[PDB]
Amino acid sequence: TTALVCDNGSGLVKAGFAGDDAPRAVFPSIVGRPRHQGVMVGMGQKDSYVGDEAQSKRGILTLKYPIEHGIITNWDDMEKIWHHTFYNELRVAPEEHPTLLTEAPLNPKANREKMTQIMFETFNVPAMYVAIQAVLSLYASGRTTGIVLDSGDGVTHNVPIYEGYALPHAIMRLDLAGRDLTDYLM
Amino acid sequence: MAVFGAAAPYLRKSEKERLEAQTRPFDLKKDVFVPDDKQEFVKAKIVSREGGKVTAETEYGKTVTVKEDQVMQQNPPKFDKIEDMAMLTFLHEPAVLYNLKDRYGSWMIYTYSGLFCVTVNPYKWLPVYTPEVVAAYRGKKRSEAPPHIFSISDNAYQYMLTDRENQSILITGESGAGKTVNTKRVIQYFAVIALEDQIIQANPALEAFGNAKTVRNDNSSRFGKFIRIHFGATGKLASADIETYLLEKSRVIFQLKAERDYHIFYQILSNKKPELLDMLLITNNPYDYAFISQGETTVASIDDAEELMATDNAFDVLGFTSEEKNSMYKLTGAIMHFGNMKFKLKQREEQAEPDGTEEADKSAYLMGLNSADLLKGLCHPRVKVGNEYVTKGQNVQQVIYATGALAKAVYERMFNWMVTRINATLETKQPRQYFIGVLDIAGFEIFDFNSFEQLCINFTNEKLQQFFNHHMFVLEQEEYKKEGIEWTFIDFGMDLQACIDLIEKPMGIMSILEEECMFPKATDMTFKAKLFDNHLGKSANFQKPRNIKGKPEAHFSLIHYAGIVDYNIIGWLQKNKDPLNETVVGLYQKSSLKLLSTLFANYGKGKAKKGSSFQTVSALHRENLNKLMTNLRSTHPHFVRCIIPNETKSPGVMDNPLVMHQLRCNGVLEGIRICRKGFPNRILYGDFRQRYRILNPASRKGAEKLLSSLDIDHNQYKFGHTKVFFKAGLLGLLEEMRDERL
Numbered sequence: 068t069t070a071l072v073c074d075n076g077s078g079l080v081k082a083g084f085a086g087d088d089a090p091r092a093v094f095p096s097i098v099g100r101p102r103h104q105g106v107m108v109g110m111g112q113k114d115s116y117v118g119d120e121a122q123s124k125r126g127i128l129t130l131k132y133p134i135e136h137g138i139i140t141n142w143d144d145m146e147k148i149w150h151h152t153f154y155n156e157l158r159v160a161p162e163e164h165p166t167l168l169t170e171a172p173l174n175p176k177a178n179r180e181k182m183t184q185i186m187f188e189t190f191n192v193p194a195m196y197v198a199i200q201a202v203l204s205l206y207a208s209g210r211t212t213g214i215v216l217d218s219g220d221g222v223t224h225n226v227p228i229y230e231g232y233a234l235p236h237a238i239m240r241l242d243l244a245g246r247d248l249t250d251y252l253m
Numbered sequence: 254m255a256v257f258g259a260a261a262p263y264l265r266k267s268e269k270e271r272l273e274a275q276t277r278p279f280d281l282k283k284d285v286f287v288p289d290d291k292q293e294f295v296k297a298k299i300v301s302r303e304g305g306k307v308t309a310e311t312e313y314g315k316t317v318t319v320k321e322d323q324v325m326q327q328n329p330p331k332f333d334k335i336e337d338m339a340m341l342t343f344l345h346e347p348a349v350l351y352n353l354k355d356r357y358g359s360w361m362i363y364t365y366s367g368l369f370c371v372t373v374n375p376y377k378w379l380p381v382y383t384p385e386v387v388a389a390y391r392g393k394k395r396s397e398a399p400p401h402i403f404s405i406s407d408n409a410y411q412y413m414l415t416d417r418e419n420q421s422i423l424i425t426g427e428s429g430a431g432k433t434v435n436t437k438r439v440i441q442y443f444a445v446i447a448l449e450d451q452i453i454q455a456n457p458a459l460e461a462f463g464n465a466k467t468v469r470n471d472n473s474s475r476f477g478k479f480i481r482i483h484f485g486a487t488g489k490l491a492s493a494d495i496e497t498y499l500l501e502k503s504r505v506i507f508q509l510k511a512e513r514d515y516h517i518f519y520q521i522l523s524n525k526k527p528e529l530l531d532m533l534l535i536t537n538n539p540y541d542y543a544f545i546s547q548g549e550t551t552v553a554s555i556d557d558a559e560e561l562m563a564t565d566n567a568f569d570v571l572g573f574t575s576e577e578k579n580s581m582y583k584l585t586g587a588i589m590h591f592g593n594m595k596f597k598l599k600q601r602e603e604q605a606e607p608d609g610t611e612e613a614d615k616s617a618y619l620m621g622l623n624s625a626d627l628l629k630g631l632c633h634p635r636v637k638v639g640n641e642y643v644t645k646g647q648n649v650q651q652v653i654y655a656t657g658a659l660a661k662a663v664y665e666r667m668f669n670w671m672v673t674r675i676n677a678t679l680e681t682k683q684p685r686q687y688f689i690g691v692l693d694i695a696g697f698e699i700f701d702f703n704s705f706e707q708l709c710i711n712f713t714n715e716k717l718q719q720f721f722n723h724h725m726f727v728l729e730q731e732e733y734k735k736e737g738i739e740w741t742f743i744d745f746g747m748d749l750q751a752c753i754d755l756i757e758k759p760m761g762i763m764s765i766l767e768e769e770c771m772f773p774k775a776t777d778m779t780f781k782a783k784l785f786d787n788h789l790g791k792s793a794n795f796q797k798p799r800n801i802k803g804k805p806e807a808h809f810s811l812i813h814y815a816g817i818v819d820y821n822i823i824g825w826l827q828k829n830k831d832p833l834n835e836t837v838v839g840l841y842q843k844s845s846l847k848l849l850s851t852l853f854a855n856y857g858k859g860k861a862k863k864g865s866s867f868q869t870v871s872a873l874h875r876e877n878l879n880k881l882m883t884n885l886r887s888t889h890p891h892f893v894r895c896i897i898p899n900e901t902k903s904p905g906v907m908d909n910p911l912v913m914h915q916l917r918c919n920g921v922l923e924g925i926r927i928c929r930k931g932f933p934n935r936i937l938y939g940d941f942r943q944r945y946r947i948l949n950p951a952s953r954k955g956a957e958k959l960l961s962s963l964d965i966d967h968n969q970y971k972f973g974h975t976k977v978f979f980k981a982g983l984l985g986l987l988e989e990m991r992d993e994r995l
């Protein structure tokens with residue numbers, strides 16, 4: 068069968084199929100809601116726009132990210148984002164597809180636990196696994212040693228690896244990233 | 254049995270041969286009906302019921318296993334070949350299929366099925382249509398005589414004469430499966446019991462102007478033909494009337510990927526009349542004309558040139574002149590010229606203006622209007638605001654929708670007026686009393702790319718099937734009030750009306766579609782979203798689509814009586830709009846042709862005047878269906894079901910999938926299912942005794958003693974005063990105990 072590789076991070080959901088050369092779907096991980104009242108009846112306005120649709124209606128929505136620094140803070144929003152990724156961007160049924168999720172080193176334990184619980188109860192995937200975002204970088208770089216600096220959008224971290232052995236006591240994590248650079252530029 | 258002339262065998266086999274065929278072994282336990290792969294259900298035997306494992310030994314030598322949850326008994330031999338399917342001891346789906354299968358192999362065409370009359374067409378001549386059986390039936394009853402349409406014809410006649418009311422014959426089948434000739438023999442029988450030549454003579458006109466190639470048929474009828482056969486006070490032939498209903502207009506503009514427009518455009522495109530082409534500026538190339546080229550250009554349907562000639566002959570022998578045929582042909586050519594018009598937006602505005610003017614000039618020169626004037630009437634309509642006129646603005650989409658609606662309107666207008674001319678030719682001055690109408694309508698068509706038109710067709714057939722179902726309900730209440738046994742006072746119509754309420758009712762599919770083509774920036778995805786938001790789950794029959802075997806596409810699925818149908822949304826908004834242009838209609842009223850008669854006049858204190866823009870094909874269709882129901886619901890109806898045995902012209906051999914398709918889409922299965930809730934096996938006491946007295950050999954006391962000594966439960970049988978009512982299980986158990994008694 069085929070496996071799904073969903074890289075959430077925070078600020079860009081990017082998913083696809085295992086064995087491909089690049090992600091198939093790449094879109095912001097935002098969930099917008101209309102903040103005005105709506106006058107035209109018959110428009111049939113929906114109540115929340117997730118993904119790339121929310122970027123076109125920026126003018127009338129209020130955008131929220133459900134992942135602050137690696138950790139997930141709005142579980143309902145994250146559930147909506149996963150539903151959108153599975154059914155509207157990829158158009159696959161998650162009942163017959165193992166899913167590989169990623170997270171950053173040194174996150175709360177309940178984050179990963181509840182991610183698993185959702186992926187099994189709500190979406191009914193047959194299997195799943197959670198990988199560290201730096202080990203995967205080292206895989207894709209064609210190395211087996213090296214220290215990897217994975218500066219995403221919510222979290223930056225170093226993970227030194229040697230011959231395939233990670234040294235956990237030397238892992239650094241810094242909560243300065245692209246979102247803070249955006250706020251500083253603002 | 255000699256009263257049936259030479260047709261006696263085909264009409265009904267002798268009692269002697271019946272009994273000689275009765276002697277045949279049949280195991281009631283291990284020869285039950287079994288699901289199949291190549292077909293649905295095949296004749297086979299089971300070796301044993303090994304848990305969840307059985308083995309069906311069919312005739313083909315196969316030994317497949319089927320699950321214990323999909324097996325059901327086969328009809329007993331003592332009740333095979335039954336004339337009335339309703340009297341079958343076990344009412345299953347493939348049961349009736351094999352019944353009619355053996356009946357057509359044994360070459361018995363007609364078969365009673367309760368309130369229906371089913372007729373599989375024989376492909377070779379039979380003596381059953383000789384006038385001897387026609388004349389000799391006079392004096393025999395429906396309940397006893399074997400099935401045939403002459404029976405129901407006479408029953409309708411005598412019903413008319415006793416109740417002083419109209420009757421209705423509803424012949425139901427596919428064009429090219431024998432409907433024409435079935436109605437022909439009907440009208441022959443009616444003339445016999447006392448103008449058919451005129452009917453058949455004017456028929457090619459309707460065949461031209463109301464038939465088009467679909468996928469299932471190359472001569473499919475689109476309009477609802479319906480011939481009213483009036484009579485006098487003395488029940489003698491007086492005159493005949495005809496009306497057209499539900500003629501689909503969308504065909505004149507949009508055609509599917511696999512189908513053509515109406516036949517007439519192609520028949521004119523046959524160069525065998527070069528005078529028509531050089532007088533209408535019609536180039537030979539059919540790809541040239543956009544209204545038509547989107548459909549199937551040409552197919553091996555018929556000899557279209559010869560059909561053009563046959564229609565011209567029928568025209569010249571009909572009451573109307575040669576100039577009138579000339580105007581008809583030129584008007585159709587003008588409709589054809591409408592499609593190639595070209596419009597562009599203006600310089601720095603949102604107004605439509607024509608760039609190409611040549612087809613405009615030629616279409617005006619044909620229609621009898623001015624070209625500049627017609628272009629002005631299309632680009633700048635004028636509307637009435639109180640006591641003044643102000644000019645309305647249009648863009649390209651709006652002017653194109655207006656052009657399409659104008660073409661559909663003029664075509665349908667010419668069609669209705671042609672039917673009026675036909676009826677005027679037919680008209681005889683004899684006084685016309687109560688009539689008996691015969692109705693020809695489209696079928697419950699299913700495909701893999703159902704669309705708006707198929708939804709309209711299925712909605713019509715839903716109204717018809719619900720009508721018949723309520724009719725049969727009142728008929729069963731009549732049987733019960735006669736028998737003095739009255740129970741189960743629920744009607745049989747609402748269970749189907751619940752599906753109608755999902756099309757016509759406000760917030761139903763048609764209302765949502767109308768609202769969506771009224772809204773400013775509506776799209777197909779928004780239409781789908783509104784359908785789902787307003788029906789999904791909150792309804793009972795509306796539900797998700799299904800993707801099977803890689804079908805093309807489906808956006809939602811309804812369930813009907815004839816099964817689950819998946820419909821496609823794409824194009825509905827664009828194809829439902831019918832904005833008629835009032836200024837151009839006035840131009841037509843001021844023409845220099847016959848056109849001014851067709852468009853004679855068409856568009857405070859309480860006015861239901863819907864605007865010109867608030868017009869939808871679905872709404873006009875709902876209105877027409879309403880008035881057709883109002884015309885039918887005043888007459889006592891009768892129903893005729895026509896089935897093709899096989900797609901090949903070779904008789905004898907059939908196609909079980911095609912038989913099942915016809916049964917489902919026709920509603921014979923729905924009739925037997927309405928029966929299956931009461932007591933369908935209904936037999937008197939005398940023959941009951943003569944057949945089951947040896948079980949307890951010795952009228953209510955002895956029957957009751959036998960029943961109590963046969964271990965029959967109370968709710969399983971209903972005790973009547975002339976007939977005692979039993980179900981399938983009761984018949985099976987009584988059969989088994991007789992068999993062990995012997």
Ligand SMILES: Nc1ncnc2c1ncn2[C@@H]1O[C@H](COP(=O)(O)OP(=O)(O)O)[C@@H](O)[C@H]1O
Nearest residue numbers: 074075076077078079080218219220221245246
């Ligand atoms: N060319 C670029 N130059 C600078 N910053 C960039 C560029 N492209 C993306 N970014 C930043 O990277 C962040 C996205 O990082 P990403 O790898 O998607 O992390 P995550 O997947 O956790 O969101 C965004 O906040 C954006 O501001």
